[PDB]
């Protein structure tokens, strides 16, 4: 019996991420028959296991579509939540990020987030260090490209599609380049990129050597 | 000098205190009239910030959202849809959108606050599973820990705990040290898998090679001449 805990509301959810329709109805103030609501709002008729055998189910995007189609006070709260969520997401409210993270049924999802945040931490300190060491123009993108070539084997949005392992390798490479720039007192795009690419090739060759059948 | 608020494809010029450049906000909601006309019609605050090119009209994001839902333009409705898309993803616990929110916040103590509230990177956990799958048990799990503590911290786990005055080792570890340990844990896991290493002996020898390779990368970056 899995649930989506969205604030005080506890919406029971199927294995493939569909809400119990009856709980969704009382949660949108929908007193209409489900069969009549299905037809009016153009929703599929489907059933899932929540405990009490097979019961009507609605996807989360269809739930949100219903919230925005209706005018009941209940539907109007859900509309308000969406507007406040958009405001807070755009503002960078880490309270909301943590609430969303903690809503994911898979603990491995929050482990991915930890690796993702280590990567942004390292990238940020690398870009700041490069800025102070006379980095200009394209250097910030060029750094990203080198890091992504080496780990992927072939930048902020590409990292949303990397595994947690790939992200930790990126975080390491970036933190090491930052350390090497600080120590070298290397200056300018050419020297900085030569140094970053060096760190990047050294770590890849390291992985490849350790991965040989012995 | 110039700051931009990134939200999916949209790049909004933003002040240091998180207000939006009102002109860009206008075309983003298909607002045709002067900002001056807009201020009185919707009752918005007259605000100005330096976005990089001098004093220009500004609007907060909560006021921006309110406009997007008050207006009925094509542009306004694309933002209404971003809100519906975001509620759906928020309800399902999409850690990708949690990441994008966190990255919009420049306050570094916010990343720390959030990072804290989260779990590990699972790098330690996955190594232990891999070692077990390739045929290994005993104090081998304890030994893999001790091999990696030697290389990163310079001494034994207990030796680090007394010099730093900590009951548990991980309370005494820097952000840097934690990453270096997770990195070693990551690299060895895939090396064991690729090399097809089997047995305690073979898993421990490869782990030493990786941890020792790490220390040398770190030492080289810092131009450290370690005597050992």
* Domain boundary pick from B67, B82, B107: B107
Contact state of A207 with B188 under an 8 Å Cβ cutoff: no
The angle at the Cα of B126, spanning B123 to B131, to the nearest 5 degrees, equals: 125
A202 and chain B: CB distance < 8 Å anywhere?
Answer: yes
Asked if residue A97 and residue A112 are part of one domain, the reply reads no
Token representation of residue B81: 């849809």
Token representation of residue B60: 């907060």
Q: Kind of pairing, strands A18-20 and A47-51? A: unpaired
B112 occurs within a structural domain: no
* Domain boundary pick from A101, A123, A149: A101
Q: What residues form DSSP beta bridges with B55?
A: B50
Fill in the DSSP letter of residue B169: G
> Within 10 A of A28 (CB to CB), how many other CB atoms are there?
21
Report whether B169 contacts B149 (CB < 8 A).
yes
Domain count along chain A: 2
Asked if residue B98 and residue B130 are part of one domain, the reply reads no
End-to-end distance of chain B based on CA atoms, in angstroms? 47
B64 occurs within a structural domain: yes
Q: How far apart are CA B126 and CA B137, in angstroms?
A: 15
> Within 10 A of B169 (CB to CB), how many other CB atoms are there?
17
Report whether A66 contacts A58 (CB < 8 A).
yes
Report whether A170 contacts A159 (CB < 8 A).
yes
Residue A14, CA atoms < 13 Å, CB-side half-sphere: 19
Report whether B104 contacts B5 (CB < 8 A).
yes
Asked if residue B128 and residue B75 are part of one domain, the reply reads no
Per-residue 3-state assignment (H helix, E strand, C coil) for B59-125: EEHHHHHHHHHHCCCHHHHHHHHHHHHHHHHHHCCCHHHHHHHHHHCCCHHHHHHHHHHCCCCCHHH
What are the C-alpha distances in Å from B120 to residues A58, A169, B26? Answer: 34, 15, 43
> Within 10 A of B203 (CB to CB), how many other CB atoms are there?
25
Token representation of residue A142: 């060029």
Provide the experimental method for this PDB entry: X-ray
Residue B23 lies in domain: 4-107
Report whether A150 contacts A123 (CB < 8 A).
no
Q: What are phi and psi of A51, to 5 degrees?
A: 140, -55
Which residues of chain A from 104 to 143 reach within 8 Å of chain B, CB to CB? 104-105, 107-118, 120-122, 124
Asked if residue B133 and residue B87 are part of one domain, the reply reads no
Asked if residue A200 and residue A114 are part of one domain, the reply reads yes
Rounded to a whole number of angstroms, the distance from the CA of A30 to the nearest CA of chain B is 19
Token representation of residue A189: 């795009």
Token representation of residue B65: 């959202």
Asked if residue A124 and residue A91 are part of one domain, the reply reads no
The distance of Cα B199 from the centroid of its chain, to the nearest Å, equals: 36
Asked if residue A79 and residue A111 are part of one domain, the reply reads no
Of the candidates B105, B115, B196, which has its C-beta nearest A114's C-beta?
B115
B54 occurs within a structural domain: yes
A7 and chain B: CB distance < 8 Å anywhere?
Answer: no
Q: To one decimal place, what's the resolution in Å?
A: 2.5
What are the C-alpha distances in Å from B143 to residues A53, A95, B158? Answer: 50, 39, 14
Residues whose CB is less than 8 angstroms from the CB of residue B164 and which lie 6 or more positions away in sequence, other chains included: B172
What are the C-alpha distances in Å from A102 to residues A4, A14, A54, A132, B90? Answer: 10, 18, 28, 37, 10
* Domain boundary pick from B50, B73, B107: B107
> Within 10 A of A127 (CB to CB), how many other CB atoms are there?
17
> Within 10 A of B36 (CB to CB), how many other CB atoms are there?
10
Report whether A60 contacts B88 (CB < 8 A).
yes
B105 chain-A contacts, CB cut-off 8 A: 92-94
Rounded to a whole number of angstroms, the distance from the CA of A11 to the nearest CA of chain B is 10
Asked if residue A17 and residue A46 are part of one domain, the reply reads yes
Kind and range of the H or E element at A6?
strand A3-6
Token representation of residue A28: 């949108």
Token pair 């491995």: residue: A108
Contact state of B120 with A98 under an 8 Å Cβ cutoff: no
Q: How far apart are CA B103 and CA B109, in angstroms?
A: 12
């Amino acid at each position: 019996p899995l649930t989506l805990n969205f604030g005080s509301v506890r919406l029971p959810v199927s294995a493939d991420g569909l809400l119990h329709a009856p709980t969704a109805q009382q949660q949108l103030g929908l007193t209409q028959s489900w069969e009549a609501a299905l037809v009016e709002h153009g929703l599929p008729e489907t059933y899932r296991d929540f405990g009490a055998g097979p019961e009507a189910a609605v996807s989360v995007p269809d739930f949100v579509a219903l919230a925005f189609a209706l005018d009941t006070p209940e539907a109007r709260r859900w509309q308000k939540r969406a507007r406040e969520l958009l405001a807070r997401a755009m503002q960078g409210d880490v309270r909301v990020a943590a609430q969303i993270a903690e809503r994911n049924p898979e603990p491995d999802a929050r482990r991915w987030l930890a690796a993702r945040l280590e990567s942004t931490g390292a990238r940020r300190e690398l870009l700041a260090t490069v800025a102070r060491h006379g980095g200009e123009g394209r250097v910030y993108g060029q750094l990203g490209s080198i890091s992504n070539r080496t780990v992927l084997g072939k930048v902020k949005a590409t990292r949303d599609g990397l595994t947690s392992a790939e992200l930790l390798r990126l975080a390491y490479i970036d933190t090491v380049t930052a350390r090497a720039i600080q120590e070298s007192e290397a200056r300018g795009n050419a020297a900085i990129l030569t140094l970053h690419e060096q760190v990047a090739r050294s770590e890849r060759q390291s992985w490849e050597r350790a991965g040989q059948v012995q």
